[PDB]
């Protein structure tokens, strides 16, 4: 019985920190997802507008 | 290598030639019309991005008032005397301010 | 990419002698029956928001 209270604690410990990994995975991977695009946006207009632009 | 070179001058002679075709006044004005579809390019990703500030900051509000739900929770299990589940809630309240934290850094970027 | 640039070039010199073509005064009243219109299907959606509140 006392051994039960640990393991009880120990479970619901386990749990907790899977749960937490799990709000950080959605948060890391919009990061990324935002990051992809945020990239490509700015390359790609700065470069076109500058590029057709000055070939007129 | 040499052989790329002079490939290159070769088709770049052809393409050249096509260039010289058009009329540069009509080119220009394609090109403004060309230099203004990449401003709508840039105006949807630019407003993409204001939608996702805004969904950092609703995952903010959704994990501050879990806090709060959680403080009420502790509360609950302080006047029932229950002094153990009161910790195990102020354990879920600390990370969901610590993320709060992150989320607010994002978002100040952002 | 240069092909892409060449491409709309020679699509735009077409479209803006068609645009050339019209005279921008019947194209400004159609232009306005256009905008009309427009304000036809705003009116339609507004109205059903009406219709999603009261529901």
Redesign the interface.
Same mark, same amino acid.
């Given at each position: 019985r006392t051994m039960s209270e640990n393991l009880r604690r120990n479970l619901a410990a386990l749990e907790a920190k899977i749960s937490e990994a799990k709000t950080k995975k959605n948060m890391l991977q919009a990061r990324a997802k935002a990051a992809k695009a945020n990239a490509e946006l700015q390359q790609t207009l700065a470069a076109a507008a500058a590029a057709a632009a000055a070939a007129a | 290598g040499l052989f790329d070179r002079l490939g290159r001058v070769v088709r770049a002679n052809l393409?050249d030639l096509?260039?010289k075709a058009?009329?540069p006044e009509?080119? +220009?004005?394609?090109?403004?019309?060309?230099?203004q579809e990449?401003?709508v390019? +840039?105006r949807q990703?630019?407003a993409? *991005?204001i939608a996702?500030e805004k @969904? *950092?900051e609703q @995952?903010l509000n959704q994990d501050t008032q879990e806090a709060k739900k959680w403080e009420d929770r502790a509360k609950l299990a302080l006047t029932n005397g229950e002094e153990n589940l009161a910790r195990?809630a102020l354990?879920?309240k600390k990370?969901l301010t610590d *993320?709060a934290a992150?989320?607010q850094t994002?978002l100040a970027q952002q």
């Open positions: - | 393409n096509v260039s058009e009329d009509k080119v +220009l004005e394609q090109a403004v019309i060309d230099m990449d401003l390019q +840039l990703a630019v993409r *991005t996702e @969904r *950092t @995952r195990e354990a879920r990370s *993320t992150a989320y994002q």
